[PDB]
Amino acid sequence: DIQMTQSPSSLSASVGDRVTITCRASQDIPRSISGYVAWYQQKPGKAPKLLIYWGSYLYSGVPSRFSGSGSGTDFTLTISSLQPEDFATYYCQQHYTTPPTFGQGTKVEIKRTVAAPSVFIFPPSDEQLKSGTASVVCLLNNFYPREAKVQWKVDNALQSGNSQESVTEQDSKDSTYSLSSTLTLSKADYEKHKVYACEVTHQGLSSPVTKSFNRGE
Amino acid sequence: DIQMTQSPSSLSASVGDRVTITCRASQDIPRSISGYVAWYQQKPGKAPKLLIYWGSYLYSGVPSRFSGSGSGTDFTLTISSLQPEDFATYYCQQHYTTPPTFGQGTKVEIKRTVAAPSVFIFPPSDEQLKSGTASVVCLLNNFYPREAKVQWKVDNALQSGNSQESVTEQDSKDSTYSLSSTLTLSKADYEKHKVYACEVTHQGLSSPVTKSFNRGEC
Amino acid sequence: EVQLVESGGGLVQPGGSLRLSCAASGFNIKDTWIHWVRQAPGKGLEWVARIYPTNGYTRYADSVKGRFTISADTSKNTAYLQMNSLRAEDTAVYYCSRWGGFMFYAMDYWGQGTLVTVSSASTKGPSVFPLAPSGGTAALGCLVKDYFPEPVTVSWNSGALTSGVHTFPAVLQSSGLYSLSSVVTVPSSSLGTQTYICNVNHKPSNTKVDKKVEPKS
Amino acid sequence: EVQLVESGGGLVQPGGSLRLSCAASGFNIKDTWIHWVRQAPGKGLEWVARIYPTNGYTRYADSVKGRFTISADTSKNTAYLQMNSLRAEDTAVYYCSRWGGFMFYAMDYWGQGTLVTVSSASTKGPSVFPLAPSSGGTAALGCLVKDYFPEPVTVSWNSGALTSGVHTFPAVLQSSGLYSLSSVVTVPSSSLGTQTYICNVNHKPSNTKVDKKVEPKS
Ligand SMILES: [Cl-]
Ligand SMILES: [Cl-]
Ligand code: NA
């Protein structure tokens, strides 16, 4: 039916930049019907929070850098000076219709200076080895930009297809990411080999960093 | 733009009848937009009272004989057993739009058994005659139906254009009406004539009835 | 004990201004929305304006935009309708009304209405003349003649006589002044012994009259 | 102290049924309207349903109509969502929310959400293993929370006393069909001698609660 088309789907900007998110009603709607457009902010792991209601009213406690306006069937949310804590997905909501519908959302990412990761490596625990599996974990802490390559080597053999990575969402204070790479091996393979190495390539490093350990030392 | 049309604009029904009034949006409206139609009752000289809200919810304390419903863009108010006290104008209201709009109203009259008027004629008071004007009043009291004809004659001259009528609102208990007809004359004209007569035609009388007086007799 | 009470209506010249007040009790207007609805003599209801007092949000019928302003004072629990540039066609009874609970779109309590009359004609109090009566029932009354503006109220024997009383709607004479009668029917045998007095009040001109109506000699 | 707390989420087989509850405090649901909104993994918000508890009026999205039912119990200040004939596409976090004051159309308070996983696979509790501190004056340490189903797991450090430097990674789905995640923290290397670090793990679906002390190996 009537929907909101929200754009762009994502954007990045620097701290202190002004950003503008737009929602358009998907069709022509008489002026005699009110949309009461609301905007919400949703941070990772969290429920949406109300920012703006009835097009342009600032919800109590919301910082004044947020504002909304509406004209015809076009609606915008503006953040007049972007802060790192404003990393979030933002959604509009129209109430022309019952049920009301949400926009598809816009992810706002914070641009910042390059930060190299600190890298750490973790052997499997003796407790895990007892169960017959071995996980080796490599941590890349507090880095920017997101792009990073982690390569595993076991006695100099390149490991391909037996690790999985996970990445945190941009940090709400320093705008960095962290990343784990976990290499899974059988207990028997782990015990056949000596040198376990994680090699990390990132923009903030002049050449790749390796962390390693020797099983049992 | 979006308006509601009520129909009919007026009706008469007997006590105990089932009455249904319809409210129709003036155009097609997607199902996705809710109208939250309300129905209001307005009695003479009073504020409207809410009857029904959101299409079909009965407002607290409203008699259960009233109910509403709607399918798509058509809404209905139903009075299951009309009572004499339900004489009123009924209004629907749509909230598809902001501002919401009202329907044009439906006037419900209670149909009862015919009742002839009692007729009285009043000459001008001596107090008014001092002012230079003469009002002659003809009262038709407690009758049904509302339609009545009053003809004034002054020494057998039919009076046309120098009278005005007022009718009461239907009585909320006995469902009758009363009517006054006032003839306005100059003092000088009033004193040139003798016989002042109002002649009433009404369905409850078998032929026209006349009340009259002669000026200066008691 | 939910109550709305309007005041401030009266006679005002074309192009003048007037402010209406609506005093609420039994509830706080800050918990809800307040509305003004009007009704021209003999016509339908016309929605005028509404406000959400807590944040000042207002909306108006097109027919009053730019001329009327709705406002509220939450500390006094009162709402207002400032009306400027009045025209003949703004003549009407003006009602204020609320929503209750969180039941939107249902005007559940209304005030009694206050009449606004927009005209160049001057205030005039009426003259009161008897309609003298001559083991049945007799009719008598009072002719309340030549007044402006509306309204006049009539009672009989200070409120003790209500049975059989009809007070007719006023009619506008070609003079531009209103006239009305009030009649009552009584036992013909009460005529020698029961005093009948009509109490007329034309508030707009501050004119109160008590007129004894009796059989002429 | 306005609050909404959801419960009743967890694992359910396709075609199965579940009821969520939303317990309110700091206001009464009688005074307002209650809504359910959902979010499938990594997708947007989808409105599900709404209720006006005082008269039981309800509305529903087309995608759940006839399978879900929203209701409320005002004496318990609690609202519910009955979800029947569940499919994979109903897997989501389900949030309850309210309007406040008489401010329609603005969901001003929301609950924390509860995850509903619609799957044929079986519940499996995790194992918890230390990532033992072995970068300048800062050491990293953690817990590996391995092989559980369904989501979610929660991890805190020293019962919420340790929040700075903590990263709890989103879970990854292994080819086994089981989840795993790590939680790490950077701390001062000089602290490792004297300061106790304990990761507190909870997997509610299997009723697994673990407190694991992580320390330097031998
Ligand atoms: Cl309304
Ligand atoms: Cl909403
Ligand atoms: Na005859």
PDB file of N, CA, C and O in Angstrom, chain A residues 85-124:
ATOM      1  N   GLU A  85      28.596   8.649  19.389  1.00  0.00           N
ATOM      2  CA  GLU A  85      27.540   7.853  19.999  1.00  0.00           C
ATOM      3  C   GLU A  85      26.289   7.767  19.080  1.00  0.00           C
ATOM      4  O   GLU A  85      25.359   7.034  19.360  1.00  0.00           O
ATOM      5  N   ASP A  86      26.319   8.456  17.954  1.00  0.00           N
ATOM      6  CA  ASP A  86      25.229   8.437  17.037  1.00  0.00           C
ATOM      7  C   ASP A  86      25.292   7.312  16.032  1.00  0.00           C
ATOM      8  O   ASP A  86      24.371   7.193  15.194  1.00  0.00           O
ATOM      9  N   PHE A  87      26.340   6.506  16.083  1.00  0.00           N
ATOM     10  CA  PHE A  87      26.320   5.255  15.379  1.00  0.00           C
ATOM     11  C   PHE A  87      25.079   4.371  15.749  1.00  0.00           C
ATOM     12  O   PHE A  87      24.794   4.100  16.956  1.00  0.00           O
ATOM     13  N   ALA A  88      24.290   4.012  14.723  1.00  0.00           N
ATOM     14  CA  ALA A  88      23.009   3.424  14.909  1.00  0.00           C
ATOM     15  C   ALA A  88      22.352   3.200  13.531  1.00  0.00           C
ATOM     16  O   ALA A  88      22.847   3.684  12.558  1.00  0.00           O
ATOM     17  N   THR A  89      21.258   2.468  13.485  1.00  0.00           N
ATOM     18  CA  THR A  89      20.334   2.485  12.356  1.00  0.00           C
ATOM     19  C   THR A  89      19.138   3.302  12.737  1.00  0.00           C
ATOM     20  O   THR A  89      18.644   3.217  13.874  1.00  0.00           O
ATOM     21  N   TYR A  90      18.726   4.171  11.812  1.00  0.00           N
ATOM     22  CA  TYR A  90      17.612   5.037  12.052  1.00  0.00           C
ATOM     23  C   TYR A  90      16.427   4.608  11.161  1.00  0.00           C
ATOM     24  O   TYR A  90      16.598   4.237   9.971  1.00  0.00           O
ATOM     25  N   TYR A  91      15.242   4.646  11.752  1.00  0.00           N
ATOM     26  CA  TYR A  91      14.023   4.274  11.035  1.00  0.00           C
ATOM     27  C   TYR A  91      12.977   5.383  11.141  1.00  0.00           C
ATOM     28  O   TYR A  91      12.777   5.934  12.267  1.00  0.00           O
ATOM     29  N   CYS A  92      12.312   5.697  10.004  1.00  0.00           N
ATOM     30  CA  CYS A  92      11.050   6.450  10.035  1.00  0.00           C
ATOM     31  C   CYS A  92       9.889   5.570  10.162  1.00  0.00           C
ATOM     32  O   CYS A  92       9.942   4.351   9.974  1.00  0.00           O
ATOM     33  N   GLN A  93       8.771   6.172  10.538  1.00  0.00           N
ATOM     34  CA  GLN A  93       7.544   5.440  10.708  1.00  0.00           C
ATOM     35  C   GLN A  93       6.422   6.331  10.303  1.00  0.00           C
ATOM     36  O   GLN A  93       6.336   7.390  10.818  1.00  0.00           O
ATOM     37  N   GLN A  94       5.578   5.891   9.394  1.00  0.00           N
ATOM     38  CA  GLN A  94       4.377   6.611   8.984  1.00  0.00           C
ATOM     39  C   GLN A  94       3.109   6.044   9.585  1.00  0.00           C
ATOM     40  O   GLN A  94       2.956   4.845   9.658  1.00  0.00           O
ATOM     41  N   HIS A  95       2.169   6.904   9.935  1.00  0.00           N
ATOM     42  CA  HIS A  95       0.854   6.531  10.500  1.00  0.00           C
ATOM     43  C   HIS A  95      -0.315   7.066   9.647  1.00  0.00           C
ATOM     44  O   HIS A  95      -1.411   7.253  10.129  1.00  0.00           O
ATOM     45  N   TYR A  96      -0.085   7.360   8.368  1.00  0.00           N
ATOM     46  CA  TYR A  96      -1.220   7.496   7.435  1.00  0.00           C
ATOM     47  C   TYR A  96      -2.139   6.259   7.528  1.00  0.00           C
ATOM     48  O   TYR A  96      -3.395   6.386   7.575  1.00  0.00           O
ATOM     49  N   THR A  97      -1.507   5.074   7.506  1.00  0.00           N
ATOM     50  CA  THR A  97      -2.162   3.796   7.552  1.00  0.00           C
ATOM     51  C   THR A  97      -2.233   3.189   8.955  1.00  0.00           C
ATOM     52  O   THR A  97      -1.403   3.480   9.848  1.00  0.00           O
ATOM     53  N   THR A  98      -3.236   2.355   9.151  1.00  0.00           N
ATOM     54  CA  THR A  98      -3.312   1.494  10.316  1.00  0.00           C
ATOM     55  C   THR A  98      -3.344   0.077   9.755  1.00  0.00           C
ATOM     56  O   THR A  98      -4.260  -0.250   8.999  1.00  0.00           O
ATOM     57  N   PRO A  99      -2.318  -0.754  10.018  1.00  0.00           N
ATOM     58  CA  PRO A  99      -1.069  -0.578  10.754  1.00  0.00           C
ATOM     59  C   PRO A  99      -0.115   0.494  10.160  1.00  0.00           C
ATOM     60  O   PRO A  99      -0.078   0.690   8.931  1.00  0.00           O
ATOM     61  N   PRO A 100       0.653   1.151  11.039  1.00  0.00           N
ATOM     62  CA  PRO A 100       1.671   2.025  10.561  1.00  0.00           C
ATOM     63  C   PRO A 100       2.811   1.199   9.985  1.00  0.00           C
ATOM     64  O   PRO A 100       2.973   0.047  10.360  1.00  0.00           O
ATOM     65  N   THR A 101       3.603   1.754   9.101  1.00  0.00           N
ATOM     66  CA  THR A 101       4.772   1.001   8.614  1.00  0.00           C
ATOM     67  C   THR A 101       6.057   1.759   8.855  1.00  0.00           C
ATOM     68  O   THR A 101       6.062   2.994   9.000  1.00  0.00           O
ATOM     69  N   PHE A 102       7.154   1.009   8.880  1.00  0.00           N
ATOM     70  CA  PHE A 102       8.492   1.563   9.076  1.00  0.00           C
ATOM     71  C   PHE A 102       9.216   1.690   7.757  1.00  0.00           C
ATOM     72  O   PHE A 102       9.003   0.893   6.850  1.00  0.00           O
ATOM     73  N   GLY A 103      10.083   2.662   7.663  1.00  0.00           N
ATOM     74  CA  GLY A 103      11.085   2.716   6.613  1.00  0.00           C
ATOM     75  C   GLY A 103      12.084   1.577   6.715  1.00  0.00           C
ATOM     76  O   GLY A 103      12.148   0.862   7.778  1.00  0.00           O
ATOM     77  N   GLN A 104      12.856   1.367   5.643  1.00  0.00           N
ATOM     78  CA  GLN A 104      13.760   0.205   5.626  1.00  0.00           C
ATOM     79  C   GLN A 104      14.976   0.431   6.501  1.00  0.00           C
ATOM     80  O   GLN A 104      15.754  -0.486   6.712  1.00  0.00           O
ATOM     81  N   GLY A 105      15.209   1.658   6.917  1.00  0.00           N
ATOM     82  CA  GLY A 105      16.343   1.978   7.819  1.00  0.00           C
ATOM     83  C   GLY A 105      17.573   2.528   7.137  1.00  0.00           C
ATOM     84  O   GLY A 105      17.834   2.285   5.944  1.00  0.00           O
ATOM     85  N   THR A 106      18.321   3.353   7.851  1.00  0.00           N
ATOM     86  CA  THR A 106      19.541   3.871   7.350  1.00  0.00           C
ATOM     87  C   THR A 106      20.608   3.670   8.400  1.00  0.00           C
ATOM     88  O   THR A 106      20.469   4.187   9.515  1.00  0.00           O
ATOM     89  N   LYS A 107      21.670   2.996   8.005  1.00  0.00           N
ATOM     90  CA  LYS A 107      22.816   2.810   8.891  1.00  0.00           C
ATOM     91  C   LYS A 107      23.756   4.001   8.769  1.00  0.00           C
ATOM     92  O   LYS A 107      24.246   4.301   7.690  1.00  0.00           O
ATOM     93  N   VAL A 108      24.053   4.611   9.888  1.00  0.00           N
ATOM     94  CA  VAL A 108      24.982   5.721   9.988  1.00  0.00           C
ATOM     95  C   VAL A 108      26.266   5.251  10.598  1.00  0.00           C
ATOM     96  O   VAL A 108      26.264   4.787  11.736  1.00  0.00           O
ATOM     97  N   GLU A 109      27.338   5.328   9.805  1.00  0.00           N
ATOM     98  CA  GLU A 109      28.680   4.897  10.214  1.00  0.00           C
ATOM     99  C   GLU A 109      29.562   6.142  10.419  1.00  0.00           C
ATOM    100  O   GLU A 109      29.413   7.155   9.700  1.00  0.00           O
ATOM    101  N   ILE A 110      30.439   6.062  11.416  1.00  0.00           N
ATOM    102  CA  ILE A 110      31.352   7.115  11.781  1.00  0.00           C
ATOM    103  C   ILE A 110      32.724   6.917  11.086  1.00  0.00           C
ATOM    104  O   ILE A 110      33.372   5.862  11.229  1.00  0.00           O
ATOM    105  N   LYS A 111      33.135   7.902  10.292  1.00  0.00           N
ATOM    106  CA  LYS A 111      34.482   7.963   9.709  1.00  0.00           C
ATOM    107  C   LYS A 111      35.418   8.520  10.750  1.00  0.00           C
ATOM    108  O   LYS A 111      35.148   9.566  11.331  1.00  0.00           O
ATOM    109  N   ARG A 112      36.574   7.887  10.902  1.00  0.00           N
ATOM    110  CA  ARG A 112      37.599   8.406  11.798  1.00  0.00           C
ATOM    111  C   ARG A 112      39.008   8.107  11.295  1.00  0.00           C
ATOM    112  O   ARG A 112      39.208   7.515  10.227  1.00  0.00           O
ATOM    113  N   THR A 113      40.014   8.528  12.062  1.00  0.00           N
ATOM    114  CA  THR A 113      41.400   8.228  11.690  1.00  0.00           C
ATOM    115  C   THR A 113      41.742   6.757  11.770  1.00  0.00           C
ATOM    116  O   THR A 113      41.138   5.990  12.524  1.00  0.00           O
ATOM    117  N   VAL A 114      42.732   6.361  10.975  1.00  0.00           N
ATOM    118  CA  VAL A 114      43.197   5.001  10.955  1.00  0.00           C
ATOM    119  C   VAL A 114      43.740   4.626  12.359  1.00  0.00           C
ATOM    120  O   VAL A 114      44.372   5.445  13.033  1.00  0.00           O
ATOM    121  N   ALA A 115      43.413   3.428  12.838  1.00  0.00           N
ATOM    122  CA  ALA A 115      43.980   2.897  14.106  1.00  0.00           C
ATOM    123  C   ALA A 115      44.355   1.454  13.828  1.00  0.00           C
ATOM    124  O   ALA A 115      43.535   0.623  13.365  1.00  0.00           O
ATOM    125  N   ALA A 116      45.613   1.134  14.083  1.00  0.00           N
ATOM    126  CA  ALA A 116      46.093  -0.241  13.925  1.00  0.00           C
ATOM    127  C   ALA A 116      45.506  -1.119  15.053  1.00  0.00           C
ATOM    128  O   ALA A 116      45.384  -0.661  16.162  1.00  0.00           O
ATOM    129  N   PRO A 117      45.216  -2.376  14.767  1.00  0.00           N
ATOM    130  CA  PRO A 117      44.812  -3.298  15.843  1.00  0.00           C
ATOM    131  C   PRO A 117      45.938  -3.716  16.736  1.00  0.00           C
ATOM    132  O   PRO A 117      47.021  -3.886  16.234  1.00  0.00           O
ATOM    133  N   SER A 118      45.679  -3.909  18.017  1.00  0.00           N
ATOM    134  CA  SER A 118      46.496  -4.778  18.866  1.00  0.00           C
ATOM    135  C   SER A 118      46.060  -6.220  18.629  1.00  0.00           C
ATOM    136  O   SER A 118      44.870  -6.524  18.645  1.00  0.00           O
ATOM    137  N   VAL A 119      47.002  -7.105  18.478  1.00  0.00           N
ATOM    138  CA  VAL A 119      46.724  -8.455  18.121  1.00  0.00           C
ATOM    139  C   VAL A 119      47.130  -9.399  19.272  1.00  0.00           C
ATOM    140  O   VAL A 119      48.212  -9.260  19.836  1.00  0.00           O
ATOM    141  N   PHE A 120      46.267 -10.348  19.596  1.00  0.00           N
ATOM    142  CA  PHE A 120      46.542 -11.334  20.611  1.00  0.00           C
ATOM    143  C   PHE A 120      46.191 -12.673  20.128  1.00  0.00           C
ATOM    144  O   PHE A 120      45.280 -12.849  19.308  1.00  0.00           O
ATOM    145  N   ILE A 121      46.956 -13.667  20.586  1.00  0.00           N
ATOM    146  CA  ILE A 121      46.683 -15.055  20.238  1.00  0.00           C
ATOM    147  C   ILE A 121      46.457 -15.923  21.475  1.00  0.00           C
ATOM    148  O   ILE A 121      47.119 -15.749  22.500  1.00  0.00           O
ATOM    149  N   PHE A 122      45.492 -16.798  21.380  1.00  0.00           N
ATOM    150  CA  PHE A 122      45.115 -17.743  22.468  1.00  0.00           C
ATOM    151  C   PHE A 122      45.114 -19.201  22.051  1.00  0.00           C
ATOM    152  O   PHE A 122      44.283 -19.653  21.215  1.00  0.00           O
ATOM    153  N   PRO A 123      45.991 -19.999  22.707  1.00  0.00           N
ATOM    154  CA  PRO A 123      45.891 -21.423  22.563  1.00  0.00           C
ATOM    155  C   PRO A 123      44.578 -21.960  23.072  1.00  0.00           C
ATOM    156  O   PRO A 123      43.898 -21.319  23.922  1.00  0.00           O
ATOM    157  N   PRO A 124      44.249 -23.187  22.661  1.00  0.00           N
ATOM    158  CA  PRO A 124      43.127 -23.880  23.260  1.00  0.00           C
ATOM    159  C   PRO A 124      43.470 -24.168  24.707  1.00  0.00           C
ATOM    160  O   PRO A 124      44.649 -24.406  25.007  1.00  0.00           O
TER     161      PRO A 124
END
